Design a protein around this nucleic acid. Structure first.
Lengths: 92, 92, 108, 80, 104, 92, 96, 82
DNA sequence: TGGAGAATCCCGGTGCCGAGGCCGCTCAATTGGTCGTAGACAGCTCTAGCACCGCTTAAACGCACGTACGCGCTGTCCCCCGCGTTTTAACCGCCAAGGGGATTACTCCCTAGTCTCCAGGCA
DNA sequence: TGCCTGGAGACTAGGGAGTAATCCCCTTGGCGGTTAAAACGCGGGGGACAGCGCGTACGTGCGTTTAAGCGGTGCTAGAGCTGTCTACGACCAATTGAGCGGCCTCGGCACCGGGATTCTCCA
């Protein structure tokens, strides 16, 4: 257990393709945006920009989370690593 | 020579707390606060005038710059007395 | 000529509408500045100043003091969530910190 | 309603293995979904404000780029 | 009728940068050397990024500059990373990097 | 009729890499990079003119903004290129 | 004789130096440090006293916030002693 | 010529700064790391302050130069003007 | 649980220097009118956003199982905390030289403004 | 590759800055006392760290489901452009009054010192 995980690490870091599916993310954007206005409309490039930004944000957060996990002498990331990284970066 | 928001902050303080004074360093920090928030709102209204290919800053740009900068309840209340002051200026 | 009424008086404001208008015109923010823009901006500046001055007077009264010092401004800004979020990258001179000790350092 | 579940557990694992994470707890996924929802709410609220100022009913890509740009998250490749 | 960009040995347009500086609400007046200097600095930074992007495309055996090559060019140089730290490049990804204790 | 820095990135790329092409998305990234660097240097030079009570932007404000924003060797070679271009422009 | 347990005096200094607002670095050695750092950029330089006080307030606030993040990193590793790897992790996550 | 004034940032001063930050126990290797961090921060701020001084053709670094150098790095300081 | 010592807090007296109020005056806000243009409004086009269907297939999901890993406990020994004493240099007050910031007046030039046309630039 | 539109040449005007003289704020350097703070030393206690065991929770592989995605059709909201006009903001002259600099008083608060009330640690 870990050779397929490290193979997935060496596979996904090299590529630039988006890891979240298109339509569930678009549904999530239209669900979140509905609280601010009713009957909003979205360009497709707007949803693609939101997907690129969200994926880059989550990957940078997981990099800092992994740094916290190695700091606590662990290989498994936990929610306390995420909230510590968000606390230090100023989001929490 | 020099100008500052020293008397207006004192008038606001005596409106709010009639029994409470203020020192020189605290007045200087309040002056820095007013100048900093002025620069933030004016720079955002400049960028919003530039985004819409407009050459005028109006109360609409100041309102949406207040909505962009200030957090939620602060933004709602600041829009409330901004619209109140503009309505009292036009009507009276 | 009639009696000169200031632009702050007819807007019901204490902050100067004309000074804000001059600083907007001379700040190279736009080619034109409207009439309601300095009224709106002076109202917002007066509101934010009054919000800090309420909590700073409360902090000064909690320390049994009369005059507001930078420490009371620090306590007022950091003890209110919206004002701490607005001034998150701001250092108050002679402000200090909130008294905060973690629970794992307190002895059992 | 409840489209945060469309951010699936293998998608969160793909984002973690891109970040270099080798082992993942089972409580990571709900935390990641909440963090993604907070980030999306902030950026989308800013972009909807930028759309409201233009008297427009369509969120363009420019609104998303300026919304990301205000928070220090400048994005190239769309008109930044 | 000679363009000011050819008189400075620059490929970037001096006149377009001067027009953008005039109507950008930066100052009331613009000096004559400011668009020349700004076009030179922009041409230098574009040339540096295109240098490292071409090197990344050549080392990875391709003839086209893609966003992955721009990503590798920006995040591999230290000072370009310091210039573009808070900037995301779309369809660029991240570097292949693994923590040293995770390796077998 | 959109304006872009695309043909000048073509010219600089042909000046440095004759046998290399570029995609549309990579050209969009280069155009956004050029515009972001332009607005950074122009904003810092505008602030430098405002601080020093100058109503004009000369090559000295652009020099100081370039020295403030870019890191070390990039700033040194950028001010070298800018000084060379300004001297050659005044020579012609 | 009477001696306190290790940590009682440290908590007393924590409460004492969190209740106060004074600068915690002596002004003359910080001034000399500012002089030797500024002479590597330009020689024959002078400083206003308000500039040195602004530098000291900024430096002390930066170090206090860094020590708060360092303490969070040390408590994350189930410790009470801050170590240089905590400073390194806090500055790595911050992006410095 | 000034030399080795980073040792004037003493160990009890760093202890006081850590006590303000809520630190209860301090390792003995903290002080050299903290001195290096303080030197890096001061070099970064003082370089832009000196640049702002040199643009004005002045020989004295004023409080405005320090406040603008801190404001350019996202570290706005209230109380010294601006 | 209790007592010695330490530490914290509370209350009265004293001075001191900075908040705060008053006066002059000046320069910047206000008032009234003029003029050009920015923006609001009306109308029309056609791009593109959205709704829906069919399939087909990669991808999500459920589960079974084993092992790597988190986590609790324990020992130990290093290293940092608390305190006492000594040495060092920070700090306060004074005492000037003078260096350079700030102001003012006059002078040059160079950048805004405008007419025309032509060569880059884009679709 | 043809139209188009913004850049270039060139003339004028006047204000933005350059420079020289002046003047005085305030930076730097110095001396001496004093005394607070850093530095050094040392005992001990408690926390960092290595080791071990266990129990469980993720990783992984396989079979089943599901809905993402690609292609295709179609409808219409609304982005986007153009034309017209009009109200709104820049601008200018005159005026005048609010704010700023300076001066002066007095009281909020820092300091000091003694006494009551927690508070920590060891019997």
């Amino acid at each position: 257990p870990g050779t397929v995980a490290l193979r997935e690490i060496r596979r996904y870091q090299k590529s630039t393709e988006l890891l979240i599916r298109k339509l569930p993310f678009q549904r999530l954007v239209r669900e979140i945006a509905q609280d601010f206005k009713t009957d909003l409309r979205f360009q497709s490039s707007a949803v693609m920009a939101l997907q690129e930004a969200s994926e880059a944000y989550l990957v940078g957060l997981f990099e800092d989370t992994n740094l916290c996990a190695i700091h606590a002498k662990r290989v498994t990331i936990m929610p306390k690593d995420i909230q510590l990284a968000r606390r230090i970066r100023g989001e929490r | 020579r020099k100008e500052s928001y020293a008397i207006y902050v004192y008038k606001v303080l005596k409106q709010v707390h009639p029994d409470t004074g203020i020192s020189s360093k605290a007045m200087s920090i309040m002056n820095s606060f007013v100048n900093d928030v002025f620069e933030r709102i004016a720079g955002e209204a400049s960028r919003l005038a530039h985004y819409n290919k407009r050459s005028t800053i109006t109360s609409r740009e100041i309102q949406t710059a207040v909505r962009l900068l200030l957090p939620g309840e602060l933004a709602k209340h600041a829009v409330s007395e901004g619209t109140k002051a503009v309505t009292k200026y036009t009507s009276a | 000529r009639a009696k000169a009424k200031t632009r702050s008086s007819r807007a019901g404001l204490q902050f100067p509408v004309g000074r804000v208008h001059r600083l907007l015109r001379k700040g190279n923010y736009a080619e034109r500045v409207g009439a309601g823009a300095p009224v709106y901006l002076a109202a917002v500046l007066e509101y934010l100043t009054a919000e800090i001055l309420e909590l700073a007077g409360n902090a000064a009264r909690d320390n049994k003091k009369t005059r507001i010092i930078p420490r009371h401004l620090q306590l007022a800004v950091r003890n209110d969530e919206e004002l701490n979020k607005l001034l998150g990258r701001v250092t108050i001179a002679q402000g200090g910190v909130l008294p905060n000790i973690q629970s794992v350092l307190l002895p059992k | 309603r409840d489209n945060i579940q469309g951010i699936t557990k293998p998608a969160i694992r793909r984002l973690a293995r891109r970040g270099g994470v080798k082992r993942i707890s089972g409580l990571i996924y709900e935390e990641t979904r909440g963090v993604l929802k907070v980030f999306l709410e902030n950026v989308i609220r800013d972009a909807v404000t930028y759309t409201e100022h233009a008297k427009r009913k369509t969120v363009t890509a420019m609104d998303v780029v300026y919304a990301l740009k205000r928070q220090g998250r400048t994005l190239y490749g769309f008109g930044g």
